[PDB]
């Protein structure tokens, strides 16, 4: 179709499908969460919605499953047990470190068909469409 | 993040969220299916996976729910009851015709921040990354 956002879902689904084959137990939302926890340990669970793209509900179920698999650990505010702080466990660290090159490689199967200038320009368009 | 595909999911989720508010009972996959049935009535259910971006399973559940709401109707091959042909009902026609301007409008909140040349160029990048 000639619809930009239809072709967008085409590209996004192909990337997701390749991601699923390569990382069957770590989806892109789960991977992004873990990336965001690594470069900000103790990040607030609420601040992790922007840093990972999600809703409060989806992040809650995600973090529960990751907590259930020993990938992350969480601590609460003593004054407001609603707010939570999230860290990556040593097991989660190992999972994340191994997944980064695989994710980069899945990105590269698509980004690699673009020049560095084209990749940068794709990024400025996507950012201009958001802000 | 500086990751093109992370920002892609950012843009795609914002568009989906606005789509959900405007068309709560017609998701983008459901809308794309209906568009593809309109300009090819009697299309084979299997051929509707490409024309709508989906898996066989997701399309089956989608078409069942749409059939259950009288939006589409289906006929089978007499020699192979597995294969199905899909049409839009008159009620589905009305739903589709009303949804097209709303969808275009949701697309426009993002595409409108781009010049015609920028929109065309975003499309060539997305297509170059797929083929």
Q: Would you give the distance in Å from CA B73 to the centre of its chain?
A: 17
Q: Would you give the distance in Å from CA A65 to the centre of its chain?
A: 15
DSSP B50-116: TTT---HHHHHHHHHHHHHTTSEEEEE-SS-TTSEEEEE-HHHHHHHHHHHHHHHHHHHHHHTTS-H
What are the CA-CA distances from residue B12 to residues A7, B4, B5, B29 (Å)? 11, 12, 10, 13
What are the CA-CA distances from residue B1 to residues A33, B8, B63 (Å)? 12, 11, 37
Q: Closest by alpha carbon to A29, among B29, B14, B10, B18?
A: B10
- The whole-angstrom distance between B64's CA and the closest CA on chain A is 22
Closest partner CB to B9 (pick from A4, A6, A53): A53
What is the resolution in angstroms? Answer: 2.6
From chain A, pick out residues whose CB is under 8 angstroms from the CB of B35. Answer: 1
Cα distance between the two ends of chain B: 26
Q: Where are the domains of chain B?
A: 4-129
Residue B115 is encoded by which pair of tokens? 């010049």
| Beta-carbon separation of A129 and B3 below 8 A | no
| Beta-carbon separation of A129 and B123 below 8 A | no
Per CB distance under 8 Å, which residues of A are interface residues toward B? 1-15, 28-29, 32, 35, 53, 107, 110-111, 113-114, 118-119, 121-123, 125-131
CATH architecture of B4-129: Orthogonal Bundle (1.10)
Locate the DSSP E strands across A1-131.
Answer: 43-44, 72-76, 84-88
Residue B35 is encoded by which pair of tokens? 């568009």
Other beta carbons within 10 Å of B17: 12
Residue B9 is encoded by which pair of tokens? 């999911």
Q: Closest by alpha carbon to B6, among A37, A28, A118?
A: A28
From chain B, pick out residues whose CB is under 8 angstroms from the CB of A131. Answer: 113
C-alpha span between B47 and B36 (Å, rounded): 10
- The whole-angstrom distance between A63's CA and the closest CA on chain B is 19
**Experimental method of this PDB entry:** X-ray
Cα distance between the two ends of chain A: 26
């Amino acid at each position: 179709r000639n619809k930009a956002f239809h072709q967008l879902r085409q590209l996004f689904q192909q990337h997701t499908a390749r991601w699923q084959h390569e990382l069957p137990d770590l989806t892109k939302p789960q991977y992004a969460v873990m990336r965001a926890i690594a470069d900000k340990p103790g990040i607030e669970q609420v601040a992790l919605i922007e840093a990972a793209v999600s809703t409060k509900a989806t992040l809650a179920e995600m973090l529960a499953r990751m907590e259930n698999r020993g990938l992350v650990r969480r601590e609460h505010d003593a004054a407001d047990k609603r707010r939570r702080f999230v860290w990556l466990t040593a097991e989660g660290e190992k999972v994340l470190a191994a997944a980064i090159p695989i994710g980069d490689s899945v990105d590269e199967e698509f980004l690699g068909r673009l020049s560095a200038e084209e990749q940068e320009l794709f990024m400025q368009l996507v950012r201009k469409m958001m802000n």
